C-alpha cells in the first residue's frame, strides 16, 4: 500500500502545468484514503489552475471533514485558501458575451 508516491509523483506534474494529469494521480489519494484531506488538497489546487473552481470549492470543504488531527492541520490551512479564491473566480466575468445588434428578442413577421 502507498499514498505518498501518488502525492509526490503528481507533486511535480502539477507544478509543470499538467494540472489534470497531476490530479490523475492525486485522485488515488482520495480513493485510497477517501477520509483524508491532502487527497482533496492536491486535486483541489490543480482545479484552480484548470479553473474548475466549481469543483475546487467542493474539494476544499471536503478536506475539512477529515482534518480532525494534527497530521492534517497542514491541509486544513489550504482547504481555506483555494476554497475562497475558486468561488471568487468560478464564474467571475464582468465582460461576458452579452451584446445585441439585430432584431428584438421575439420579433414576428406573419
Amino acid at each position: 500500500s502507498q499514498f505518498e508516491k501518488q502525492k509526490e509523483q503528481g507533486n511535480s506534474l502539477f507544478k509543470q502545468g499538467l494540472y489534470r494529469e497531476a490530479v490523475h494521480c492525486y485522485d488515488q489519494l482520495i480513493t485510497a484514503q477517501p477520509q483524508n484531506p491532502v487527497g482533496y488538497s492536491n486535486k483541489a489546487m490543480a482545479l484552480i489552475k484548470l479553473g474548475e473552481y466549481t469543483q475546487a470549492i467542493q474539494m476544499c470543504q471536503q478536506g475539512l471533514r477529515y482534518t480532525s488531527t494534527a497530521e492534517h492541520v497542514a491541509i486544513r490551512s489550504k482547504l481555506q485558501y483555494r476554497l475562497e479564491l475558486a468561488q471568487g473566480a468560478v464564474g467571475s466575468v464582468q465582460i461576458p458575451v452579452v451584446e445585441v445588434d439585430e432584431l428584438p428578442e421575439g420579433y414576428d413577421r406573419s
Binding site: K7, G10, N11, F14, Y26, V38, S41, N42, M45, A74, I75, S77, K78, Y81, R82
Partner: peptide, 9 residues
Amino acid sequence: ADTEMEEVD
C-alpha cells in the same frame, strides 16, 4: 516563493 498554499501536501 511566499506560499505553501501553492504546494500540494
